[PDB]
């Protein structure tokens, strides 16, 4: 029923570009730091409204959270990384390179895990 899944995936994929770029935006342009914050606000209003949209949709027909329980975590960590990037930034190149690697590595894996969840869900629920 892939209508919504494709848009949701695109929100997270571009949003990863926001944090990747946010993260990635520190290596490439350090002064953006506070500018990066603006992204946190923005990236944070965007996700909070999505939870609401998805808050009403859930109302219409209840079922597995899988993805949500999946989408919820990913949001949270992007969320908690943004906050850490913020703290990492607030506290505030080796760490960034480190925090770029850790981010990427984390998000590739969480996204890999989350994508797996999505992959695993479609085989399980399919049966």
């Amino acid at each position: 029923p892939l209508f919504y899944i494709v848009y949701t995936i695109i929100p997270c994929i571009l949003i990863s570009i926001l944090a990747i770029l946010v993260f990635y935006l520190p290596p490439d342009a350090g002064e953006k730091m506070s500018l990066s914050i603006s992204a946190l606000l923005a990236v944070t209003v965007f996700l909070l409204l999505l939870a609401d949209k998805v808050p009403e949709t859930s109302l219409s027909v209840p079922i597995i959270i899988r993805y949500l329980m999946f989408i919820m975590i990913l949001v949270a960590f992007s969320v908690i990384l943004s906050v850490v990037v913020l703290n990492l930034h607030h506290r505030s190149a080796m760490v960034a390179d480190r925090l770029f690697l850790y981010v990427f590595f984390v998000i590739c894996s969480i996204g890999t895990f989350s994508i797996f969840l999505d992959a695993s869900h479609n085989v399980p629920p399919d049966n």
């Binding site: 730091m33 506070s34 500018l35 914050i37 603006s38 606000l41 944070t44 209003v45 909070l48 939870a51 609401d52 808050p55 949270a76 969320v79 908690i80 906050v83 913020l86 703290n87 607030h90 506290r91 505030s92």
Partner: protein, 127 residues
């Protein structure tokens, strides 16, 4: 129906980080105060909309008024601390610890008190 008590506690907990980070984000990096300003707007729209979501819910599903006062109080103190923490910020190595110390100490207490009010109300609830 604990689906809202999770997300609400999560808004507060992360929002504490905004302030804590707002508070903690001054001492570590004061230069981002305006950038800070942006967080106040952001932190303030997010809360103002949460009062919304919750209004429709409460009015939709009736419940006891006393548990609602706590949300308001707590929310209004983060809100008042911000104002002061912003005045603080505006006015703002010793003072932030100072403000951070008096914030933390107040929020841990208030939060401790509020958590007790749930706790104690939890004590009664359990029986």
């Amino acid at each position: 129906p604990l689906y809202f008590v999770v997300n609400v506690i999560i808004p507060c907990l992360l929002f504490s980080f905004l302030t804590g980070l707002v508070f903690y984000l001054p001492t570590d990096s004061g230069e981002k105060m305006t950038l800070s300003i942006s967080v106040l707007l952001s932190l303030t729209v997010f809360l103002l909309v949460i009062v919304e979501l919750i209004p429709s819910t409460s009015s939709a599903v009736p419940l006891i008024g006393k548990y609602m006062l706590f949300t308001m109080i707590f929310v209004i103190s983060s809100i008042i601390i911000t104002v002061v923490v912003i005045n603080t910020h505006h006015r703002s190595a010793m003072v932030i610890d100072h403000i951070l110390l008096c914030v933390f100490m107040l929020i841990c207490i208030i939060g401790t008190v509020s958590v007790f009010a749930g706790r104690l109300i939890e004590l009664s609830q359990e029986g």
